[PDB]
Design a protein around this motif. Sequence first.
Motif, PDB file in Angstrom:
ATOM      1  N   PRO B   2       0.809  -1.263   0.000  1.00  0.00           N
ATOM      2  CA  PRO B   2       0.000   0.000   0.000  1.00  0.00           C
ATOM      3  C   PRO B   2       0.843   1.317   0.000  1.00  0.00           C
ATOM      4  CG  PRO B   2      -0.066  -0.965   2.200  1.00  0.00           C
ATOM      5  CD  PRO B   2       0.836  -1.857   1.362  1.00  0.00           C
ATOM      6  N   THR B   4       1.584   4.704   0.899  1.00  0.00           N
ATOM      7  CA  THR B   4       1.388   5.868   1.775  1.00  0.00           C
ATOM      8  C   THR B   4       2.093   7.103   1.204  1.00  0.00           C
ATOM      9  OG1 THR B   4       3.264   5.215   3.229  1.00  0.00           O
ATOM     10  CG2 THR B   4       1.022   4.549   3.941  1.00  0.00           C
ATOM     11  N   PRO B  10      -4.064   6.351   2.406  1.00  0.00           N
ATOM     12  CA  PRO B  10      -3.292   5.197   1.916  1.00  0.00           C
ATOM     13  C   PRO B  10      -3.975   4.444   0.741  1.00  0.00           C
ATOM     14  CG  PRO B  10      -3.242   5.248   4.351  1.00  0.00           C
ATOM     15  CD  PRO B  10      -4.137   6.381   3.891  1.00  0.00           C
ATOM     16  N   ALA B  11      -3.177   4.154  -0.296  1.00  0.00           N
ATOM     17  CA  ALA B  11      -3.648   3.655  -1.592  1.00  0.00           C
ATOM     18  C   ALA B  11      -3.321   2.176  -1.806  1.00  0.00           C
ATOM     19  CB  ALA B  11      -3.012   4.468  -2.705  1.00  0.00           C
ATOM     20  N   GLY B  12      -4.339   1.406  -2.194  1.00  0.00           N
ATOM     21  CA  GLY B  12      -4.179  -0.023  -2.478  1.00  0.00           C
ATOM     22  C   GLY B  12      -3.491  -0.306  -3.813  1.00  0.00           C
ATOM     23  N   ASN B  19     -10.546  -0.787  -5.994  1.00  0.00           N
ATOM     24  CA  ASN B  19     -11.401   0.384  -6.196  1.00  0.00           C
ATOM     25  C   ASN B  19     -10.699   1.482  -6.974  1.00  0.00           C
ATOM     26  OD1 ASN B  19     -14.275   0.739  -5.100  1.00  0.00           O
ATOM     27  ND2 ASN B  19     -13.317  -0.393  -3.391  1.00  0.00           N
ATOM     28  N   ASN B  43     -13.033 -18.047 -13.401  1.00  0.00           N
ATOM     29  CA  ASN B  43     -14.436 -18.301 -13.094  1.00  0.00           C
ATOM     30  C   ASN B  43     -15.298 -17.083 -13.448  1.00  0.00           C
ATOM     31  OD1 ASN B  43     -16.544 -20.091 -11.790  1.00  0.00           O
ATOM     32  ND2 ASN B  43     -16.775 -18.277 -10.536  1.00  0.00           N
ATOM     33  N   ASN B  53     -24.732   3.301  -1.238  1.00  0.00           N
ATOM     34  CA  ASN B  53     -24.958   1.944  -0.810  1.00  0.00           C
ATOM     35  C   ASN B  53     -25.484   1.080  -1.945  1.00  0.00           C
ATOM     36  OD1 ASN B  53     -24.447   2.785   2.013  1.00  0.00           O
ATOM     37  ND2 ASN B  53     -26.380   3.913   1.750  1.00  0.00           N
ATOM     38  N   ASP B  78     -29.680  -0.901  -2.346  1.00  0.00           N
ATOM     39  CA  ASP B  78     -28.748  -1.475  -1.325  1.00  0.00           C
ATOM     40  C   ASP B  78     -28.576  -2.984  -1.139  1.00  0.00           C
ATOM     41  OD1 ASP B  78     -31.075  -1.171   0.102  1.00  0.00           O
ATOM     42  OD2 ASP B  78     -29.938  -0.785   2.023  1.00  0.00           O
TER      43      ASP B  78
END
Lengths: 138, 150, 138, 138
Positions: B2, B4, B10-12, B19, B43, B53, B78
């Motif tokens: 991640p 920083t 903080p970025a994935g 996302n 799959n 939501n 939702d």
Amino acid sequence: PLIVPYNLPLPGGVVPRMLITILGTVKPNANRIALDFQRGNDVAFHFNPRFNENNRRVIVCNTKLDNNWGREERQSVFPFESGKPFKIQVLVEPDHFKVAVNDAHLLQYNHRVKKLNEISKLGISGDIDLTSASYTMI
Amino acid sequence: YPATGPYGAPAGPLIVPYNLPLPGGVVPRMLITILGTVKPNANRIALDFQRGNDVAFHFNPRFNENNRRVIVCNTKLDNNWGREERQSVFPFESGKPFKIQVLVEPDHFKVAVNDAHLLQYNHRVKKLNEISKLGISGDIDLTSASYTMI
Amino acid sequence: PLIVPYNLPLPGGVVPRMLITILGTVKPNANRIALDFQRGNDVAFHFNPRFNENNRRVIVCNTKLDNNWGREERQSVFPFESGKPFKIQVLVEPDHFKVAVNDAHLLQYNHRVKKLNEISKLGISGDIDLTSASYTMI
Amino acid sequence: PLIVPYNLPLPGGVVPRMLITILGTVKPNANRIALDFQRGNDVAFHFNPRFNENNRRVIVCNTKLDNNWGREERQSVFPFESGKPFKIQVLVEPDHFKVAVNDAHLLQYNHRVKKLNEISKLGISGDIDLTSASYTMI
Ligand SMILES: OC[C@H]1O[C@@H](O[C@H]2[C@H](O)[C@@H](O)[C@H](O)O[C@@H]2CO)[C@H](O)[C@@H](O)[C@H]1O
Ligand SMILES: OC[C@H]1O[C@@H](O[C@H]2[C@H](O)[C@@H](O)[C@H](O)O[C@@H]2CO)[C@H](O)[C@@H](O)[C@H]1O
Ligand SMILES: OC[C@H]1O[C@@H](O[C@H]2[C@H](O)[C@@H](O)[C@H](O)O[C@@H]2CO)[C@H](O)[C@@H](O)[C@H]1O
Ligand SMILES: OC[C@H]1O[C@@H](O[C@H]2[C@H](O)[C@@H](O)[C@H](O)O[C@@H]2CO)[C@H](O)[C@@H](O)[C@H]1O
């Protein structure tokens, strides 16, 4: 008596001040009851008492649009008893259905289907003996 | 993995499930590009355009639904999935690169794969500006993910 | 830090006497939280606190086999509060998972996915900031 | 004729070599037809032809366990027409229900419900005029 599953015609629709009355006896070892108000390909109002959902009793209400059930409304108030007589009354208002069991207010479900006039049948099914299915226009 | 630093939260890493933030949300003439490779023995693949939501637009290639390949599109308000839109044209192939493009129009999303048009999906969620993020998951190794106006 | 949604790997699976502990903080105006114990294309155990279903807070538990959710197990005990710190503990037993939030035992969910050794991954998502995800083998 | 929805009693359950025959006529402007083999609180076998699902005709088959539908099996072979008569046949075998329409094989549906002898009832519903519904062993 009346045979279940049973169809109650409502040609020319539901209309405000209308009162549907369903009398009968819940079977012994009852699992479920359902009232299904139908409009064309849809179920405008599904009233579904469930006698055992993971050892709770629950009433589930919802709307089916063609093949898709919508948001479930769940209530735990449950006046039915296995092997006992019942009376279900459905009052039609402008914005909602009101439901009573055994002469006491139970719930309201806001209309999602708006064209009340197109709601043409009431299916009555599940573990009941049915005595009468009738409606009052006040 | 991640990232920083001082430029935001903080970025994935570019690893599924991921996302892609859409600040300003979505607007017509927007073009999302996604590059990657399908894993071997895929799959499923999924793109999930999210608002609050809800999932405004779910694009879901399935590689075996009872030995058929099918793409399923739908909307989730939702906790409830609505009317499914199923289509049978399925360009993806196990262990093969792919490019998915999503062009935003005012009536609908258009989706193209490997430079050729695949399907259209009419907007059920109307407030396009509110669509915050884009989820990208499933059996893909992901190479890039970006947007630009046209 | 930990980024949400977060994957906690469980390579070599879930095994009796294993206790997963998740610490973090519920965001303001939370809608949902989800713990997803994954197995290949299935979700062996989904634990899903919802902050608002028709103005009730409910925890929904289930299992997803490929694209199908199974029987829902619903629980109304709900110790989470918006903006406040939480602790979720999941104890693995041979026949069920036990779940406790903020040290209060909440529920049991019977294994539906029986091959506990294949449950590879725990997904942690929803309206939280996560401080740690770890487990103990005892 | 007979009136829809209707339950064909299946006294002593289903058993291999049972052949269920259903005659009727599809209504003008059909949307759906449904056959529902019932065992207690479950549907062992739902056969659901749909005349328009996103402008595609499709037959969806499935099993219902309490309130949960399992994995859908979709076939696009669809021999029914609005206004046209039809003859649906269902041959029970040890491993599956075989289905034929107008004397031409259509599909198979493996048993998910295994205790065939508890399948007490067959439900017939949808946009049809049911002429007859009967069985016999072969
Ligand atoms: O599977 C039989 C069952 O399907 C339900 O509709 C499904 C539908 O086929 C699927 O496309 C959608 O996403 O989920 C629906 C809800 O399970 C019908 O509502 C039901 O009557 C049966 O026909
Ligand atoms: O059961 C877990 C599953 O629930 C889905 O939502 C359900 C909802 O709980 C039920 O009341 C409704 O009628 O059916 C929905 C569709 O399955 C969630 O969408 C899913 O994410 C899980 O949380
Ligand atoms: O509609 C997208 C949504 O589908 C769910 O799976 C459906 C499935 O496509 C349908 O055939 C079955 O009858 O109902 C399932 C449950 O709603 C997926 O579970 C979900 O991930 C989305 O892909
Ligand atoms: O909501 C009315 C509708 O419920 C279906 O059952 C639901 C069930 O209540 C829900 O908990 C589960 O997650 O999804 C099921 C499938 O939608 C019933 O099967 C249907 O008969 C209606 O009663």
